[model samples]
Target: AQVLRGTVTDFPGFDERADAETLRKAMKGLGTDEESILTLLTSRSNAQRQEISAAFKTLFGRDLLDDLKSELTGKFEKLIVALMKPSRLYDAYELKHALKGAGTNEKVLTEIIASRTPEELRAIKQVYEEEYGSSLEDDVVGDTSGYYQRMLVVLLQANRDPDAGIDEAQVEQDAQALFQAGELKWGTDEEKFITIFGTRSVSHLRKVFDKYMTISGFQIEETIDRETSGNLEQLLLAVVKSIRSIPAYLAETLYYAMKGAGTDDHTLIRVMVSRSEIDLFNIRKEFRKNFATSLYSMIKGDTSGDYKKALLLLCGEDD
Candidate 1:
């Protein structure tokens, strides 16, 4: 098997104290050397960056985020700040931003809540409570309603079956159950959808999706489109797609962000920073296969200047 790669990883011969001093020297000079700053920080994994932040405080008794904020500006500054945070905390912050505003950002909610592993969801939920002093679930229920909210609640428990076993008989039976829930009935039965999609292991769901086509004469996604609409539709489909393949789901997301005339920098950053050290290489592969263009070149054409350099660095290399 070919070895998979992440865009970021541990730096060889790393010296946190040296990295911290270099960061201080760069910012303390006549003008901030933005290139050096971006180069040094983006090269380390998120965990390594966190250690670098600790070393910075031990040496200079200052918060790295504060120093970086004072030195850097514009979109580049925002991206650098994102790179400095603990990955779990960063995710919690994104969820808070999605839920806290006047109108909810459902795309952020759906992409995050539907895509994370059960353990990741558990940490994000716990961090949301500890940092924000309220229930993430309550916040969602207040802003959302009906089956969509129910689906979010189910995911929040972070208790999806992790085992990927398939009982062949159960697989066929569940496919039939799903058919009856939507296509075989007059009105959609959403609870059944929530329980199964929200809780089933991904391997089993893949089988269910395959068998579903045989029984319903339509793909599961097609049945979902026929039965559901709006937020519910989006969340359910996200669950389906995420179960099918997270890398592909993320590839589709990155494509959506850059496909428009104006790039959605928020999502582009979220995916890059969050997945930089996880499965970004696989995401690049899926992006190429699904979109027929490299994520590297896409960003090359879409973003500009120092921000573009930072993003491309995280991209690792061209396809």
Candidate 2:
């Protein structure tokens, strides 16, 4: 398996003390110096940022997070906080916010659960339990219904064993099962779709997808397009794309976030901040491949001021 590259690198002479002091000065003044804040926070990796936070408390008897929360407001505040969290905790928080409100934000749940690696999902589940004192699976079951709920619960199990050898015979069997579940029947057998998609490793599923197309004369995506609707459809499609190529899946996500009349800043912030150090390098390449415009250029046109600059910095250069 190939690894993804990230933009953020540890500075050679990085001093947590110096960064802490700079952040202190930036916030200590009458108004926050947005440029200095962006410069320091965006350049460092999340691990480095955590060190700076700790140093700030030790050096000045003040918590950098508390200071930032009091100082920054609006989208700027969100971007900074997202940068500060270890990616797992950040995602757990996003999931909590998504499910806590009047109506469930199913997109957040589907996006996080479907796209994450087994290890990441495990950490997210652990963090969710630690932070909320509740099972992630329980909350998901309570908020969602039908096969969509079942799929989310299975996915939350984080049971896809990447190390499990692919069974070529089983792959073909699952493909036929999926075909029989959807196109081969009058009404779709949604549970078969959920069970197979939820349990199979991504590499094996790629084969199943291809076999499904060969047998049914239609891609799994087309079958899904015809069979499902609402959040269930979104979850299944994301799983399919994620299995094929996670970077491409995320690139589509980033494009949709900015392509509309107004940018979906929450999605933008979540993807860029979470991926900045993980897969944003590949994501940028895929974004340009799919959109014909660099993500940097997209952000430049859609956003303004410090928020724009911070996001652009995280995006790095077009190359």
**20-57, model 2: which lDDT tens digit per residue?**
98898898869989999998888887888989999998
Give me the overall lDDT of model 2. 0.85
Candidate with maximal lDDT: 1
How does each model score on TM-score? 0.92, 0.93
lDDT of each: 0.87, 0.85
Q: What TM-score number comes out for model 1?
A: 0.92
Q: Report the CA-based lDDT of candidate 1 relative to the real structure.
A: 0.87
